[PDB]
Amino acid sequence: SDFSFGPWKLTASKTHIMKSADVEKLADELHMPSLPEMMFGDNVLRIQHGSGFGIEFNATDALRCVNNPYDWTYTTDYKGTLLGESLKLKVVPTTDHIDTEEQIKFFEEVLLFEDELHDHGVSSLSVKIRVMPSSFFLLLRFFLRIDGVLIRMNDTRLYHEADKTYMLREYTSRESKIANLMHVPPSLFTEPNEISQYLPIKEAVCEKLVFPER
């Protein structure tokens, strides 16, 4: 299930969970004791150029950004994997915010991992992309609720418009202790596009991915 638009190539695969002994193997290769219950070690969302350069998302790469007594939450600040050889996107800092304020030509949502934290909450990494006639927008979201104690959300928004020679990658981290949210219905701890807006932004980074020349 793939798509192409002008200079761009979009590859995706949505598979199932890895084998049960298969991950004790990869748990060793990443050097940490446990992997999420549901490990889509084959799912990928990739966007590339006709000059090799581009960026992908997978759960193996994302999990190498979990700290290393370990992080049984699997909180990750992974922001994609750059592609290409001899021609790659360079990461420069910038002032350009992505203010999300237009018709959809293509869309898919790829799930990367999930874990239910021994039935005490949820921990999830997913990615969407909507492609449009003039641009494409993309969102890698880590979500974490621990039942009745806190919620954390790490979003990586990625955006590119046709005749700009750069994309924009915007990282935000939100977090709140749950006992600090007065009068929010419990359904909202399960709707992450709803609650996102009522949590404090702890961190925010804004880079610009300048393209190679020729």
PDB file of C-alpha atoms in Angstrom, residues 91-99 159 166-171 204-209:
ATOM      1  CA  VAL A  91      18.703  19.773  10.496  1.00  0.00           C
ATOM      2  CA  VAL A  92      18.877  23.508  11.245  1.00  0.00           C
ATOM      3  CA  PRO A  93      16.933  25.379  13.996  1.00  0.00           C
ATOM      4  CA  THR A  94      14.283  27.928  13.046  1.00  0.00           C
ATOM      5  CA  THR A  95      11.516  30.338  14.091  1.00  0.00           C
ATOM      6  CA  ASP A  96       8.885  28.792  11.755  1.00  0.00           C
ATOM      7  CA  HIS A  97       6.063  27.297  13.856  1.00  0.00           C
ATOM      8  CA  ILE A  98       3.455  24.989  12.299  1.00  0.00           C
ATOM      9  CA  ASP A  99       0.178  26.804  13.080  1.00  0.00           C
ATOM     10  CA  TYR A 159       5.000  19.608   7.306  1.00  0.00           C
ATOM     11  CA  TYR A 166      12.539  22.768   3.311  1.00  0.00           C
ATOM     12  CA  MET A 167      10.203  20.954   5.619  1.00  0.00           C
ATOM     13  CA  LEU A 168       9.319  21.850   9.184  1.00  0.00           C
ATOM     14  CA  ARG A 169       9.629  19.422  12.081  1.00  0.00           C
ATOM     15  CA  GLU A 170       7.939  20.566  15.311  1.00  0.00           C
ATOM     16  CA  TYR A 171       8.331  18.600  18.550  1.00  0.00           C
ATOM     17  CA  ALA A 204       8.908  22.505  22.335  1.00  0.00           C
ATOM     18  CA  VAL A 205      11.575  22.328  19.584  1.00  0.00           C
ATOM     19  CA  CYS A 206      11.285  23.686  16.039  1.00  0.00           C
ATOM     20  CA  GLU A 207      13.689  22.601  13.299  1.00  0.00           C
ATOM     21  CA  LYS A 208      13.777  23.186   9.543  1.00  0.00           C
ATOM     22  CA  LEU A 209      14.932  20.326   7.283  1.00  0.00           C
TER      23      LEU A 209
END
